[PDB]
Subunit: 368 residues, 2 copies
């Protein structure tokens, strides 16, 4: 049973970090998760009985540590573990360094699409070179990510695609609880479109909002998720968009919620609307596992998760009218829509069961 | 005429840093010296009209949050043609900026990269970054070159280029000599001057042991600064001094800028490092002041001095062997003065800043 030091730059519970809980959990006995900032994510790992430590760049190897204490601390810690598992870009930088100095093999779990759209040239160059030189293995969360890695100059022979896994039990809610929650929200007699991405222009909440202007008034949207600071302009732009379309009573922000399965159960349609390619899209799968019909943007790993008209729908990114037509089709073809949504659950529960992903990972790890 | 970004970790004017003034001065029109800390060295560069900027780690890539200084240096480097790294930390940073800004890197090596001077990590880092990113590794001594290579460095990257010196600075009036010896209260002493920062490996404590084995008109001046945290060493010297009844024969002058003058005021200059010296600027300085110099037999000292010809050499750690040389300088005044006088002629050939500067410029243009 390996000793694994996991590293993640964020103290916040984003996709990558949510995914790491499931990645790490089977190793929680002899493992540790290193965060480069404190926040909600630490609590989760605590709540999941995973050892976590927050590293800082405060002072206290060699003298070179004064340049970057965080790195020195991590390098020091790395001596105690058999493996460095880096879950984000910054964690790859630090984990490369500590891989070399502490003489421990390094795994890069890639949750991003390394394209010019998504990141600066510099970030692409660094990640590719550090991975190519120091990573024993690059686990990609999707083929779209693997492909982007390769096109940015990454070494194909290092890559292995492994999708996110999910606890299937967590995705079932009582139909009373659904009635309760729809009530509490004041949407019980609406057609509820749920959007579950953190608030950020490229997640395209503003595309959905534009689409409501072409839907009948019983169609309402809940926007769930927070804004990561820097994107507070976007939060303004949404409310100014709503005001400008008279949608004040049809769009609700709940901010960041821990009760996503329940909320998905309370929706009628889950919508993924990213205007830039999505590496994976946890929400897409999550919807499918909650028996809900999902529409998604046709790019990135979304196209791997959904086939249009069989287990979900797919629309041109940034095209609100197209999204509207799907919402309206859902309203009418009740029988079809529910078939698609029930198939989606069956199919998705095969690919993405956390049990099958965890063994796909452990097999991958022990083979080096 | 290339724009050069010189980098140096220190704000204090140590040996490598003083060396850098002479390295950089001919390029000051289009160059910049970036320091990772502020201090007197900045002032010096200002006084020599060499542009200088202090970088901090206060808040390219989002990655720059990991190490802001690195991000600033990387940014700055887009405006220059070459990056010239003069210390170990400056190599780390400069390697990173070399990659990201796609600018060639030169590493000026002033250390002896051996397990005695540095941690394994420090060796491994410098060698690996140098091997991978440096177009050229300029060593200050064959001793330094060798230790690089023995630690894994790439022989074919190395070129030994010795420190240079302005010859016009190393001359003093007999009258000025007398005043200074007077001010110091040593006019009828045999004066041994030790011109090194106060760290155990500079071996002031060895000279002190030697004094007790010297004739009684012999006194020492220790010229140099102590770091905070090597104050425990300074206390030991003072205790040692007292233990040997030498309170009135050893005086500390702290850091001083009038080095040529103070060397002139000495009768002997003594280099006593207990660990191999990469180069030893004070040894050459002494020779350029026409004084007899005794040095420790190790590192790049052995390249500067042949024992009995232009100076003396002694077994590191061995005080008694140092005494014999002092005694000898006292007894054979004419021999010594010839050795001392030869030393100046010999050293003024090799280490003339002019000839070293040419040596550097031909190395740099050939790229
Ligand atoms: O307010 C929110 C928004 C999202 N999520 C969860 O976090 C994931 C969001 O990650 P996704 O892959 O959708 O986008 P990312 O954040 O990874 O770019 C989803 O699966 C949700 O279950 C959440 O708990 N609260
Ligand atoms: O009190 C002092 C001691 C030294 N120096 C100068 O700093 C250099 C010391 O460098 P050296 O190579 O002797 O020792 P390092 O500190 O470089 O190891 C000499 O050339 C001196 O000119 C000085 O200005 N004041
Ligand atoms: O599984 C990893 C998840 O988070 C990652 O950061 C990606 O951005 C997202 O596409 C994916 O759904
Ligand atoms: O190269 C100039 C000086 O640099 C180094 O720091 C050495 O410690 C010293 O021996 C050398 O003379």
């Amino acid at each position: 049973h390996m000793k694994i030091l996991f590293l993640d730059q964020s103290g916040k519970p984003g996709g990558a970090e949510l995914c790491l809980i499931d990645i790490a959990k089977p190793y929680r006995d002899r493992a540790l998760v290193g965060l480069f900032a404190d926040g909600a994510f630490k609590t989760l790992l605590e709540q999941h009985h995973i050892p976590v430590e927050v590293f800082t760049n405060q002072p206290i190897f060699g003298s070179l540590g004064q340049l970057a204490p965080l790195v020195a601390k991590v390098v020091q810690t790395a001596h105690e573990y058999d493996l460095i598992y880096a879950n984000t870009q910054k964690a790859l930088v630090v984990g490369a360094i500590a891989s070399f100095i502490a003489r421990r093999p390094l795994v890069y779990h890639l949750h991003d699409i390394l394209s010019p759209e998504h990141f600066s040239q510099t970030n692409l160059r660094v990640a590719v070179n550090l991975a190519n030189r120091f990573a024993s293995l690059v686990i990609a969360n999707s083929q779209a990510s693997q492909t982007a890695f390769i096109q940015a100059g990454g070494r194909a022979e290092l890559t292995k695609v492994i999708y996110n896994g999910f606890d299937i039990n967590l995705y079932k809610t009582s139909p009373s609880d659904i009635s309760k929650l729809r009530q509490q929200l004041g949407v019980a007699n609406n057609f509820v479109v749920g959007h579950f991405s953190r608030l950020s222009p490229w997640k395209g909440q503003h595309i959905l909002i534009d689409a409501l202007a072409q839907c009948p008034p019983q169609v309402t949207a809940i926007l769930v998720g927070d804004a990561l600071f820097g994107e507070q302009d976007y939060v303004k732009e949404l409310h100014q968009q709503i005001t400008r379309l008279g949608l004040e009573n049809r769009v609700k922000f709940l901010g960041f919620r821990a009760d996503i399965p329940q909320l998905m159960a309370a929706c009628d349609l889950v919508a993924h609307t990213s205007t830039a390619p999505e590496p994976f899209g946890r929400v897409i799968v999550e919807a499918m596992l909650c028996g809900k019909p999902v529409v998604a943007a046709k790019a990135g790993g979304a196209m791997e998760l959904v086939e249009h008209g069989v287990n979900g729908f797919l629309t041109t990114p940034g095209e609100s009218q197209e999204l509207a037509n799907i919402i309206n089709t859902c309203i009418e073809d009740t029988q079809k829509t529910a078939t698609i949504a029930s198939n989606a659950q069956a199919i998705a529960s095969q690919r993405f069961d956390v049990v099958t992903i965890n063994q796909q990972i452990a097999e991958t790890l022990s083979s080096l």
